[PDB]
From Swiss-Prot:
Acts as a guanine nucleotide exchange factor (GEF) for CDC42. Promotes formation of GPHN clusters. Residues 275-382 form the PH domain. It is found in: Cytoplasm; Postsynaptic density. Keywords: Cytoplasm, Guanine-nucleotide releasing factor, SH3 domain, Synapse. This is Rho guanine nucleotide exchange factor 9. The gene is Arhgef9. Residues 1-55 form the SH3 domain. It comes from Rattus norvegicus. Detected in brain, throughout the gray matter. Detected at low levels in heart and skeletal muscle.
Length: 389
């Protein structure tokens, strides 16, 4: 099998296979229901199946017309179950839930339901029972394009429904209550906070489902230019929703990571920074004639902290310092022999202070890594430029 990262899966640990939206991983084994081992070209690990999208020709398109019609009848039953079992009971229970609590945890979820019935209704009209592969559906998306914007208001306040859901879950009253409703509407053994997560999950699923329908769709197909037309529109609304969601998450995994680093000296990282750019293992000389230390480098926007692995507990990292990139420039050294300094070089570059005569030498192993790095530095500057600007 082969899937595609829908979203980044940032991880404070090295174990978890980390990746960016688009990275394609190869699935080896899927013993678990919601946990499978992924293999990448150089990286390897286990990823969350919930954060990824699975992948003659007419038969392939027809299959496409069917899964889509099915994932939506599925997604709607979820909405029905959510409002019928969860929202309808909370309102009745004026004694456990205020109007404020209800708006916070649910929101316009009901509003999205109304939208979905009619969007489902129009699609079922377009489906071709005789020859499923002729289903002209591209348009159905194109006429309901202005409705999908209600989702953005649901993504903004989603994390506020989780905080109020985690606060109520602590009480045994709300536990049994939430466990009681889940059993009445006949839902799987997934909680409430996970169901409230399906809408924020489908709006994204839409773009991939469409791309897949465009590969097995031919150009003369009366639907072709429409299938291509619906893909684009959605995409914008999905980016506008993310960029918010990708950026917001990357702040918890940082402070989370900083409390893991031993003997941390200095101000917290989020005081000046708020985004990590690139990390790896490189050899570095603090000053000319100095001793070579093997350290693991972390390149943030505005700064770069360096640490020292525990020799036996490889996952253990000691804090050994940090470099301010605002004052430093990245001199790209050429192989051969260095001037005192006075060492020999292979895949090395340099960091020169802007006002001082301060200099630091770095040594990667592969050329792939000196490139990735020198590209990582070009990235942290455009970001501070893009940020400050």
């Amino acid at each position: 099998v082969s899937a595609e990262a829908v979203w980044d899966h940032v991880t404070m640990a090295n174990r978890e296979l980390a990746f960016k939206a688009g990275d394609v991983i190869k699935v080896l084994d899927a013993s678990n229901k919601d946990w499978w081992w992924g293999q990448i070209d150089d990286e390897e690990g286990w990823f969350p199946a919930s954060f990824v999208r699975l992948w003659n020709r007419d038969q392939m398109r027809a299959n496409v017309i069917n899964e889509i019609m099915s994932t939506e009848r599925h997604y709607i039953k979820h909405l029905k179950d959510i409002c019928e079992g969860y929202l309808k009971q909370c309102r009745k229970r004026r004694d456990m839930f205020s109007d404020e609590q209800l708006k916070v945890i649910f929101g316009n979820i009901e509003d999205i339901y109304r939208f979905q019935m009619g969007f489902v209704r129009d699609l079922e009209k377009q489906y071709n029972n005789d020859d499923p592969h002729l289903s002209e559906i591209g348009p159905c998306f194109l006429e309901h394009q202005d409705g999908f914007w209600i989702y953005s208001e649901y993504c903004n306040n989603h994390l506020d429904a989780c905080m109020e859901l985690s606060k109520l879950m602590k009480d045994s009253r709300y536990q049994h209550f939430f466990e009681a409703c889940r059993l009445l509407q006949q839902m799987i053994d997934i909680a409430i906070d996970g169901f409230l997560l399906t809408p924020v999950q489908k709006i994204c699923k839409y773009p991939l489902q469409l791309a897949e329908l465009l590969k097995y769709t031919a150009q003369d197909h009366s639907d072709y230019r429409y299938v291509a037309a619906a893909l684009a529109v959605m995409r914008n609304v999905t980016q506008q929703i993310n960029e918010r969601k990708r950026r917001l998450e990357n702040i918890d995994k940082i402070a989370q990571w900083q409390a893991s680093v031993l003997d941390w000296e200095g101000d917290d990282i989020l005081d000046r920074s708020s985004e990590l750019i690139y990390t790896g293992e490189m050899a570095w000389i603090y000053q000319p004639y100095g001793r070579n230390q093997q350290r693991v480098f972390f390149l943030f926007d505005h700064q770069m902290v360096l640490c020292k692995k525990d020799l036996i507990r490889r996952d253990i990292l000691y804090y050994k310092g940090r470099i301010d990139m605002d004052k430093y420039e990245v001199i790209d050294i050429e192989d051969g022999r260095d001037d005192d300094f006075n060492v020999s070089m292979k895949n090395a570059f340099k960091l020169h202070n802007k006002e001082t005569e301060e200099v630091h030498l770095f040594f990667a192993k592969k050329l792939e890594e000196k490139i990735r790095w020198l590209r990582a530095f070009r990235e942290e500057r455009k970001m501070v430029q893009e940020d400050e600007k």
